[PDB]
């Protein structure tokens, strides 16, 4: 009934490289967890709100996000795309068909945090964590999404998340009545989304990076991931 997303927006034990992307685990502790709902958008397009974060948590492996995908308009679009997408419609090993989950895994396999520039972490001029976007491929390694209808199942796919950590995360997730969240502001910019999908096909090594990301995240089969 509900449609949840989980996954890492940062994995601690990845090599760091781009200074602007570094999230210092000793520094984010003061700003985590985030329990106030943050928008979930598509590819950082602010008018594509599709739902809300249910929590951003510091765990041993990194920063873990849970959210709910709630926008009727967005789900209607996703369903229309699933209707003709061959990759969305293909069987998944060991799992029953779930059209919405499969289209999401095909179109938007990646998670991406938007957060304040690291230099601007002073004693800041805007909020620290702004939003989380669904995307074709994350800039940070290990940031593949898991989409599911059962939040316990989604979190349990991450073998990197301990039994203890999972219980904590789900305690919080359970306390969120989805019906109480406000309606996301989703206005489909369909040409902009198609341009992004076209560009995503030309990302060198994309499918290799998605495969690698599943390992970096320590995701357990079976799952609806398409790479």
């Amino acid at each position: 009934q509900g449609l949840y997303v989980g996954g890492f927006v940062d994995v601690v034990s990845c090599p760091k490289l781009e200074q602007e992307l570094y999230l210092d685990p000793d520094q984010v502790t003061d700003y985590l967890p985030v329990t106030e709902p943050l928008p979930i958008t598509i590819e950082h397009l602010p008018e594509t709100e599709v739902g809300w974060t249910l929590g951003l948590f510091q765990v041993s492996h990194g920063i873990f996000c849970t959210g709910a995908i709630t926008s009727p308009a967005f789900l209607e679009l996703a369903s229309r795309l699933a209707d003709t997408s061959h990759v969305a419609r293909a069987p998944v090993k060991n799992l029953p068909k779930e059209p919405l989950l499969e289209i999401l895994h095909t179109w938007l396999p990646g998670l991406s945090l938007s957060s304040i520039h690291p230099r601007e972490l002073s004693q800041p001029s805007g909020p620290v964590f702004q939003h989380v976007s669904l995307c074709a491929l994350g800039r940070r390694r290990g940031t593949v999404a898991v989409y599911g209808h059962d939040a316990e199942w989604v979190v349990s796919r991450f073998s990197s998340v301990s039994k203890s950590e999972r219980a904590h995360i789900l305690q919080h997730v359970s306390s969120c009545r989805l019906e109480d969240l406000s309606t996301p502001n989703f206005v489909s910019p369909l040409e902009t989304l198609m341009a992004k999908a076209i560009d995503a096909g030309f990302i060198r090594d994309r499918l290799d990076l998605l495969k690698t990301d599943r390992g970096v995240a320590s995701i357990l089969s079976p799952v609806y991931l398409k790479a």
């Binding site: 992307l21 991406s112 938007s114 957060s115 304040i116 520039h117 800041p124 976007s133």
Partner: peptide
């Protein structure tokens, strides 16, 4: 503020 997207 400037946000880094991701």
């Amino acid at each position: 503020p400037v946000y880094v997207q991701x």
